[PDB]
Amino acid sequence: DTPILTFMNKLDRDIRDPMELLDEVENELKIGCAPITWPIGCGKLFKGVYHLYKDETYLYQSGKGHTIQEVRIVKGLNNPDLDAAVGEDLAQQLRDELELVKGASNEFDKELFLAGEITPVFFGTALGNFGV
RNA sequence: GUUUAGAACGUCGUGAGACAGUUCGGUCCCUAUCUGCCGUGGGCGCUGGAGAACUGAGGGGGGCUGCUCCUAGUACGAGA
Numbered sequence: 117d118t119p120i121l122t123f124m125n126k127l128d129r130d131i132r133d134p135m136e137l138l139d140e141v142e143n144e145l146k147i148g149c150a151p152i153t154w155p156i157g158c159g160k161l162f163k164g165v166y167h168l169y170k171d172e173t174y175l176y177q178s179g180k181g182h183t184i185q186e187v188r189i190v191k192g193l194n195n196p197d198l199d200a201a202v203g204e205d206l207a208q209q210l211r212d213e214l215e216l217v218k219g220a221s222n223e224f225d226k227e228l229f230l231a232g233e234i235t236p237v238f239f240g241t242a243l244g245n246f247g248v
Numbered sequence: 249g250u251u252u253a254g255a256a257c258g259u260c261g262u263g264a265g266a267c268a269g270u271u272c273g274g275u276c277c278c279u280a281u282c283u284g285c286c287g288u289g290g291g292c293g294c295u296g297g298a299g300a301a302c303u304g305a306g307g308g309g310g311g312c313u314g315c316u317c318c319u320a321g322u323a324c325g326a327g328a
C-alpha cells in the first residue's frame with residue numbers, strides 16, 4: 117500500500133476524450149481519482165492547463181521542450197482575459213466540464229491519500245516540459 | 249577520321265601490284281549585287297505653318313529551382 121499519483125503524459129498528440137479516461141482509470145484499476153489540473157483542449161489545439169486548487173491557468177508554447185520555460189498566467193477562471201486568450205472555442209467547454217467533474221468526482225485530502233484510496237492526477241506533456 | 253602522290257610489316261600473286269588489315273608523314277580560296285537579319289539616317293505624306301506633352305492598334309522581353317527552420321517529431325503508425 118504505497119501511495120500513487122498518476123500523470124497523464126503525452127498530451128500533445130490527440131488523446132481520448134479525457135473525462136472517460138479518468139473514469140476508465142478510476143474503475144478499471146480500482147484506485148479512485150481526483151484531478152488537480154485540467155487541460156484546455158488536446159492535440160493541435162492544446163493551449164494550457166487550469167489548476168484546480170491554485171485557481172489559475174497557465175499557457176503553453178510549443179517547440180520549447182528543451183529548457184524550463186517561463187510561466188504565463190491568466191489567473192482567475194471567469195476572467196474574460198482568458199476567453200480572449202484561449203477563445204470561446206474551449207473556454208465555454210472548460211466551464212461546464214469543470215462543473216461536471218467537481219460535482220461528480222472526489223476532492224483531495226492528504227490522509228486518505230496516504231493509504232491508497234485517492235490518487236491525484238496531473239495532466240501535462242513530457243516533450244513540452246509543461247506539466248512536470 | 250576517311251580519300252592522291254613517300255615508306256615499312258602480316259597476307260596474296262612468278263611479277264607489275266593488291267587487301268573495309270595495320271603502321272609513320274602529308275597546301276582547306278572568295279573585297280556581298282539581290283533576298284534575309286542586326287543597327288542608323290535622308291525624301292515625301294498625313295490638307296495653313298511651327299514647338300512640346302500624350303493616347304494605345306500592335307510587337308517583343310521575362311517566367312528556372314535547391315537546402316534550412318516554424319506548424320512538428322504533430323496527422324498516420326504496434327513500432328521503425
Ligand SMILES: Nc1nc2c(ncn2[C@@H]2O[C@H](COP(=O)(O)OP(=O)(O)CP(=O)(O)O)[C@@H](O)[C@H]2O)c(=O)[nH]1
Nearest residue numbers: 125126127128129181240241242243244245246321
Ligand atoms: N510528443 C511526445 N512524445 C513523447 C513524450 N514522452 C515520450 N514520448 C514518446 O516516447 C519516446 C520516448 O519513450 P521513453 O519515455 O524513453 O519510453 P520508455 O518507458 O523508457 C521505454 P521502456 O518501456 O523500454 O523502458 C519518444 O521518442 C516519443 O516518441 C512526450 O512528452 N511527448
Ligand SMILES: [Mg+2]
Nearest residue numbers: 249250251252
Ligand atoms: Mg582525302
Ligand SMILES: [Mg+2]
Nearest residue numbers: 252253254255
Ligand atoms: Mg604508295
Ligand SMILES: [Mg+2]
Nearest residue numbers: 254272273274
Ligand atoms: Mg614531317
Ligand SMILES: [Mg+2]
Nearest residue numbers: 278279280281
Ligand atoms: Mg566590292
Ligand SMILES: [Mg+2]
Nearest residue numbers: 281282283284
Ligand atoms: Mg533575289
Ligand SMILES: [Mg+2]
Nearest residue numbers: 281282283284
Ligand atoms: Mg541586300
Ligand SMILES: [Mg+2]
Nearest residue numbers: 285286287288
Ligand atoms: Mg530595319
Ligand SMILES: [Mg+2]
Nearest residue numbers: 286287288289
Ligand atoms: Mg533611335
Ligand SMILES: [Mg+2]
Nearest residue numbers: 289290291292
Ligand atoms: Mg523618317
Ligand SMILES: [Mg+2]
Nearest residue numbers: 304305306307
Ligand atoms: Mg499593346
Ligand SMILES: [Mg+2]
Nearest residue numbers: 307308309310
Ligand atoms: Mg515574348
